[PDB]
């Protein structure tokens, strides 16, 4: 059926919870309120307070308790109201969650999912716009997924809930209801760690994910009208990312532009770019160009100037094409 990302996510949760009693949802305002973005709407009424629980206002408590629940026998889906607020619970995430399996020689595991809205473009200022995936990808032991379509949202969230490894699931809030796509009501999962080709092309590779997809696809469409065939690759999973899908595209096109709204320095795209340079120098016809968020806190007034614009992406494409 046709549904928004919020509906797709809500369906994924409903389905996994109906299938496994161990699946529980916890976080701030996820119960009666149904979530500040309505992702958990109706779940409390259907599954009860012992499976959909509003928690005190503490991210350390949410993430840490979720870790404890996962280690003991539950399969928690913890929500951090905004990705910007993961920090108060940062030690729990990187010290307890990420390292549990490793530090215990595999005796203890963390089959938990940490959901969080992210990305700018919503006039959220400093703390309603961040894209902190880099912090997670840099932390060994965490799988990191960032979706951009309703279809992927349901498929990958269900996959994450079934995955025994801890997964940080980022949902670009500007895309929560930006479009209605066909999403099967039937049960289905998608592979974590696999990119999705949005457009095939041979003149340029556009590596992207999450938040910036609208502008990237728009830029790709405009390039087409100008006779430029760009290949658009939505990574989807940032850790472990689709190494093969990336290198195959770049090897074919010889030129790549990586796009993300996350701060440039030590960002995830910087990692992919460095890897492309290190492994495919011989296949590069142009320098790996990165179009990213600026190295500043997310500004309110200049909200639409901080988020990569179609123009910004097109300028980068031109540099790669004209090189």
């Amino acid at each position: 059926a046709l549904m928004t990302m919020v509906q797709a996510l809500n369906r994924a949760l409903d389905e996994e919870m109906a299938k496994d009693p161990r699946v529980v949802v916890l976080g701030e305002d996820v119960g009666k309120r149904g979530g500040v973005f309505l992702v958990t709407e109706g779940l409390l009424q259907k599954y009860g307070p012992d499976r959909v629980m509003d928690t005190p206002l503490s991210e350390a408590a949410i993430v840490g308790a979720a870790l404890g629940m996962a280690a003991h026998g539950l399969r928690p889906v913890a929500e951090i109201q905004f990705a910007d607020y993961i920090f108060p619970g940062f030690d729990q995430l990187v010290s307890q969650v990420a390292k549990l399996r490793y530090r215990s020689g595999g005796q203890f595991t963390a089959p938990l999912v940490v959901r969080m809205p992210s990305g700018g473009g919503v006039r959220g200022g400093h703390h309603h716009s961040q894209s902190p995936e880099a912090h997670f990808v840099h932390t060994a032991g965490l799988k990191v997924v960032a979706v951009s379509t309703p279809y992927d949202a349901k498929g990958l969230l269900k996959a994450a809930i079934r995955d025994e490894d801890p997964v940080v699931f980022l949902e670009p809030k500007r895309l929560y209801r930006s479009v209605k796509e066909e999403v099967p009501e039937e049960d289905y999962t998608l592979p974590i760690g696999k990119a999705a080709l949005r457009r095939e092309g041979k003149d340029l590779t556009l590596i992207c994910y999450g938040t910036v997809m609208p502008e990237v696809l728009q830029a790709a469409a405009e390039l087409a009208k100008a006779g430029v065939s760009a290949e658009v690759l939505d990574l989807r999973t940032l850790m472990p990312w689709d190494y093969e899908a990336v290198m195959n595209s770049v090897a074919k096109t010889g030129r790549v532009v990586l796009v993300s709204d996350a701060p440039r320095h030590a960002s995830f795209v910087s990692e992919v770019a460095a890897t492309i340079a290190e492994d495919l120098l011989d296949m590069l016809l142009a320098p790996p160009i990165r179009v990213t968020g600026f190295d500043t806190p997310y500004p309110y007034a200049q909200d639409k100037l901080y988020l990569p614009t179609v123009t910004r992406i097109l300028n980068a494409a031109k540099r790669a094409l004209d090189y």
Partner: peptide, 23 residues
């Protein structure tokens, strides 16, 4: 398994207990 950061095991203990209650 003991973790190095002081008190980092407190929230997990609470979570394990909540799991015990629910199950």
């Amino acid at each position: 398994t003991v973790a190095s950061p002081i008190a980092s095991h407190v929230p997990p203990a609470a979570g394990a207990a909540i799991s015990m209650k629910l199950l």
